[PDB]
Every structure is written in C-alpha cells, then in structure tokens.
Design a protein around this ligand. Structure first.
Ligand SMILES: Cn1cc(CNCC2CCN(c3ncc(C(=O)NO)cn3)CC2)c2ccccc21
Ligand SMILES: [K+]
Ligand SMILES: [K+]
Ligand SMILES: [Zn+2]
Length: 402
C-alpha cells in the first residue's frame, strides 16, 4: 500500500504560478517543507510512511483533457491565444497581451486578460489536479493535496475571476469516474471568500455532486451570485448549497453556519458519499485585500477538520485544493496547518487511532506556534512570527447577523 497522503508538487513549482500571485506557490511549498512535513518523515531525498512528495510524473494535458467540462472552441482558443497578439507595452512577469475582439465572447477581458504563459499555466494547473485525483483513487490513499489548483470561477465557455479552466470540476469528474460506480458521491466544500460559481454551474442539475460554498455576499462583492436561494435545478434541487456571509463576518458567524451546513450536506448524501473535495482559499482570512471576510487561521482550520474527521472516521477520500489568497504569508500559514492536519489525520488512521489531530497544533487554542526559523521566507512573517498571525482587518469585524 502507498503512503496515505499524496502531495502534488512537481519539479517546477512556478509552472502553475499566476501573474498576480507569482511568488505564492513558493511561500506555500516553503511552509509545507519546514512546518507540515518534518515530523512525519526522515526534498527528493525524504522518506515517509505518511506522505509521498510527488514530483513525477505529471500527465501531459491538452484540450482533450478539459472537454469533460469546457466547450471545445473555448479551449481551442485558449490553446492558441498567445499567438494572436503582441505583448502589451504601452515590467511584470507573465505580462498581458494586447486585447483582441475575439476575447470578448469568452470573457477573456479585465481580470481575465490573456498573458504570456497562460496556456502553460493552465496546463500545469489541470495536470496537477488530474494527477491528484488519479493518485487519490488508488487503494489505501486517504488524501491528495494540490495547493496549486482551485480555479473555481471558470465556466463551461467563459473565464472569470482570474480562472480560465476549472480544474475543480475536472478533478471532480476524474475522481468520480475512478471510484466504484456503486459509491461515488462527491461533496465539494469551497471556503475561498468568493462564491464558487463555476463549480456550482457545472453540477447545478446534478444530484451526485453536492457543491457547498461559503463566501462573502453583498453589494460590490464579486461575483455577485451565491445567495441562499440558489439550491440547484432538476435532479440537482437540494444539492447546491450556499452560505452567503455579510462583509466582514468573523469565525463566530462563518464557523457556526458552516458546521451546520456541512452536517446537513452529510445527511443529504448519506452512504453514497465517497469523497470530499476541499477548495481552500486563504482570501477569507482577515487582512486580505480582495476577500471581504475576517476569519482566523484557526477558524478555517476548524471548518476543515470537521471534513477531515468525517472522511477519516468513514474511510473516505479527501482531495484538497487551493484557490484565492492575496497575502502570501497568510496563504502559507493556512496551508501549513491544514496540511499538517491531513498528515496527522492519515498517520493516526494507519495506527488505528480514534484521535486524528494529535500531531498537529490546533491554532484555535495553541496561540504560540512559531513559524519555523528554517523557512526560506522566515523574515517575512514579522512582527511576531507565529503561525496564526494575520494582517490587520481590512473591513470591520462582524460578530452578529443584521
Ligand atoms: C461580475 N463582476 C465584475 C465586477 C467588477 N470586477 C471586480 C472584481 C474584483 C477583483 N477580482 C477578483 N476575482 C477573483 C477573486 C478570487 O479570489 N476569487 O475566488 C478575487 N477578486 C476580479 C474583479 C464585479 C463586482 C461585484 C460583483 C460582480 C462583479
Ligand atoms: K467559496
Ligand atoms: K449539485
Ligand atoms: Zn477568492
């Protein structure tokens, strides 16, 4: 049997890096190596019974690996768009291309402007998430972790919210087709600060994939959808869930409501639940410039521990993806603690334990967990260098619903 956790990294961690968050993958991997992995192992020279640090081999993906969800014409356009105009010169890495009229049909405008390397970035993202799903489906595999995925806004034939191809959807479809067609129900829990509208759209009529999105909601809050009334259509009625939070919501609101929503989702799927897909965006954390919430690291950690605890107890499968997150240190902090929770969870399972998080600090009550001094980016975690440290709140904190 393989190690129960697969961590999908690759040889080039910048391959999937997006223009606005170009260094973020580096912060995240740095924190995994120094915070999450050491206690579970003895970086290509690491030995572990708990996790596998996956650098090879990433599948080569093209248009035909994305047509399971996306329109072929849209994908063909993405595949050749960088040949269709010049770099706009009127000095950021991966710079924007000159816009052309054919971009408009597909939403490849504004935040979704084409840029050099776009198709290579899309390929690396989809490749990693498809590899994660394939390794997860293997016997003995508890979890697969691809922090570089999570492009949850992309729709069948349109880009949106910095997302071109929806690897969340493609990963759901790939994992489902490799699970026993007796028991292959999927729960997708999206705790990025914005509505998971692309994933929702893909499964709106579907009663075998339950999409649950927590997000800020209100005037001026992208993408403007995801009210409580969106519950799905047709056979999918009841299998779409949204928890729209008021701008600035804190843990007491988000954690409480999500605990209730997750438990209801567990009841809705019952014994057909085979896997939980987690879309973990750190832009819901306080201090984020583009998210509009005030969750803490321990708050997000606690929501996800509920999902980990359930999949561990019932011997299910967990696919963990990233998403948004526009403070690099906050992204790495959250990825470090969530990954360590998954590792501690998987190790406890193999030892037949019933406590799953004994080897990973709960930041909700351990308020002194240090950022490891060995981190390459250690000096960026000031002024206090603790794993729960967040920037000051950008929007005022809300503890009660209006
Ligand atoms: C469709 N639509 C377009 C706008 C105007 N654009 C503003 C946004 C703000 C900035 N932006 C954006 N995208 C993705 C993320 C993310 O993390 N998604 O998980 C965050 N931020 C795109 C543009 C807008 C504002 C409110 C509601 C809907 C609206
Ligand atoms: K969300
Ligand atoms: K659904
Ligand atoms: Zn987001």
């Amino acid at each position: 049997l393989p190690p129960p956790v697969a961590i999908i990294v690759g040889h080039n961690i910048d391959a999937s890096a997006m223009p606005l968050t170009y260094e973020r993958n580096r912060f995240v991997i740095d924190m995994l190596q120094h915070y999450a992995c050491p206690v579970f192992s003895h970086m290509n020279t690491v030995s572990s019974d708990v996790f596998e640090w996956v650098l090879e081999p990433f599948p080569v993906v093209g248009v035909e690996d994305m047509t399971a969800f996306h329109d072929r014409a849209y994908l063909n356009y993405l595949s050749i768009r960088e040949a269709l105009s010049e770099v706009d010169e009127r000095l950021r890495v991966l710079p924007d291309l000159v816009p052309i009229p054919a971009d408009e049909e597909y939403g490849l405008v504004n935040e979704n402007m084409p840029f050099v390397g776009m198709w290579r970035t899309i390929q690396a993202t989809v490749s990693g998430t498809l590899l994660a799903a394939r390794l997860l489906a293997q016997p003995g595999r508890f979890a697969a972790i691809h922090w570089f995925g999570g492009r949850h806004h992309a729709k069948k034939s349109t880009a949106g919210g910095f997302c071109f191809a929806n690897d969340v959807v493609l990963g759901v479809l790939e994992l489902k087709k490799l699970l026993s067609s007796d028991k292959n129900g999927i729960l997708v829990v999206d705790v990025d600060a914005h509505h998971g509208d692309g994933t929702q759209s893909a499964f709106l009529h579907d009663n075998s994939v339950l999409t649950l999105s927590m997000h800020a909601h209100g005037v001026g809050i992208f993408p403007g959808t995801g009210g409580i009334e969106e519950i799905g259509a047709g056979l999918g009625r009841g299998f779409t869930m949204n928890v729209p939070l008021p701008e600035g919501a804190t843990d007491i609101l988000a954690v409480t409501l999500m605990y209730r929503s997750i438990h209801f989702a567990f009841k809705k799927l019952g014994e057909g639940l085979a896997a939980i897909v987690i879309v973990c965006g750190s832009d819901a954390l306080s201090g984020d410039p583009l998210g509009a919430l005030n969750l803490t690291v321990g708050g997000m950690q606690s929501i996800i521990r509920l999902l980990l605890k359930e999949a561990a107890r019932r011997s299910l499968k967990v696919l963990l993806l990233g998403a948004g997150g526009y403070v690099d240190t906050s992204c790495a902090r959250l990825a470090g603690v969530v990954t360590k929770d998954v590792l501690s969870c998987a190790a406890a399972m193999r030892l037949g334990k019933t406590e799953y998080f004994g080897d990973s600090a709960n930041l909700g009550d351990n308020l002194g967990v240090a950022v490891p001094e060995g981190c390459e980016y250690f000096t960026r975690y000031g002024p206090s260098f603790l794993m729960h440290g967040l920037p000051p709140a950008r929007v005022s904190k809300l503890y009660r619903l209006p």
